[PDB]
Structure formats: structure tokens, C-alpha cells
Amino acid sequence: HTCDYAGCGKTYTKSSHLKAHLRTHTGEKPYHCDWDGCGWKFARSDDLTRHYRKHTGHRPFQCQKCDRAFSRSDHLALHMKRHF
DNA sequence: GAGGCGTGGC
DNA sequence: GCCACGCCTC
Ligand SMILES: [Zn+2]
Ligand SMILES: [Zn+2]
Ligand SMILES: [Zn+2]
């Protein structure tokens, strides 16, 4: 698995990874936003999932030692380290 | 917090 | 391919 574009030599493990990377060279964005009047599109599926947080303000990851909640797991993981 | 992105089990 | 974990950088 290797990117065969103009000069890019980046190599990935799976083909799923390589296929996604090539979207940076083509600008293809297969993942559209179904929100009414948004029209946004993204290269990665997880990128679109985050954009839905904007419209919904959803925050599923909640700190069990606080009332705070977060949109992403890595946000909560860093907050938890603050409680030690 | 947000964006970009590398990665692995399924 | 999906999707989730999680590191990097600002
Ligand atoms: Zn490339
Ligand atoms: Zn949208
Ligand atoms: Zn907390």
C-alpha cells in the first residue's frame, strides 16, 4: 500500500486507509450533511459525525466525577486526568 | 474545543 | 468500509 500520486510517498497499512488519503489529492468528499440547509461535505465519515455535534450540540461523553460532558472521548480523557 | 489525521477490530 | 480510539497541533 503506497500513495502513487505526483510526489506523495505516504504508505498506509490497510487499503481503506490509502483510499481515504487520496481524497486529499482529489478533494472528493463522499460524506454529505443531511441537515436541512447545510450542504456541507467531508472527506471522512468521522469528520461528518463531528459536524453533526454542531447542529445537535450533542455531548455523550460525560465525566462520572463531574456534571460536565464532552463531544469526543479524547476531550473527556484529558479532563479526567485533571481529577487524578 | 476544534480540526486533521494515523490506526485497528469488526 | 464503518467507526471508534486517540495522538498531534493550533
Ligand atoms: Zn498522497
Ligand atoms: Zn451540517
Ligand atoms: Zn469531571
Residue A10 vs residues A15, A23, A51, A53: alpha-carbon distances, Å: 12, 13, 27, 31
What single-letter DSSP state applies at residue A37?
Answer: T
**Three-class secondary structure of residue A41 per DSSP:** strand
User: Which bases of chain B come closer than 7 Å to a protein CB?
Assistant: 1-9
Residue A83 vs residues A65, A70, A71, A75, A80: alpha-carbon distances, Å: 8, 15, 19, 14, 5
- Nearest nt to A49, CA vs C1'? C3
Domains and CATH numbers, chain A: 31-83 (3.30.160.60)
Please tell me what resolution, in angstroms, this structure has: 2.5
Report how far ligand 3's centroid is from the alpha carbon of A70 (Å). 10
